[PDB]
Design a protein around this ligand. Structure first.
Ligand SMILES: [Ca+2]
Ligand SMILES: [Ca+2]
Lengths: 82, 81
């Protein structure tokens, strides 16, 4: 069989099925092992919904939450995030 | 690095150091972080497998996190401060 999943999604390690948007995003799934970086080659981490953490890092663009300024000298918050 | 291949733990680990904490605290924190690290990684695979969809494992994590928060106080702007 194909065991690669439709183009709208992707197949994890053992030919499973996970949504395309789960690969290179920030969450460690299992495309290759965690489909993070070692899959899409990480072109500037992810040019979809990204914010730049501590001195040029890449975090979720929607990590604001508190409505103030996140990463820069310290992390975004690590409070209301998760 | 090879152990911590996730920025989530990396940024939290350094945050504590940037706030200035003694080695005795950093040691316990590093240990506690390892418990969460493996747990989240396991939970990730679990969720894909369909082992936890109700959010029981994460609820347990939150309870443990409460202990951690009340032990190291690493929150920020929870509401006002
Ligand atoms: Ca991913
Ligand atoms: Ca924020």
């Amino acid at each position: 069989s194909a065991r690669t999943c439709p183009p709208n999604q992707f197949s994890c390690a053992s030919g499973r099925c996970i949504p395309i948007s789960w690969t290179c995003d920030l969450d460690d799934d299992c495309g290759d092992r965690s489909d993070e970086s070692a899959s899409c080659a990480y072109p500037t981490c992810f040019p979809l919904t990204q914010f730049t953490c501590n001195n040029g890092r890449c975090i979720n663009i929607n990590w604001r939450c508190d409505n103030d300024n996140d990463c820069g000298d310290n992390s975004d918050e690590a409070g209301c995030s998760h | 690095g090879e152990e911590f291949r996730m920025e989530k733990l990396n940024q939290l680990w350094e945050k504590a150091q940037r706030l200035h904490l003694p080695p005795v605290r950093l040691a316990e924190l590093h240990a506690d972080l390892k418990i969460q690290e493996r747990d989240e990684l396991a939970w990730k695979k679990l969720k894909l497998d369909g082992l936890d969809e109700d959010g029981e494992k994460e609820a347990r994590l939150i309870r443990n996190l409460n202990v951690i928060l009340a032990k190291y106080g690493l929150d920020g702007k929870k509401d006002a401060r």
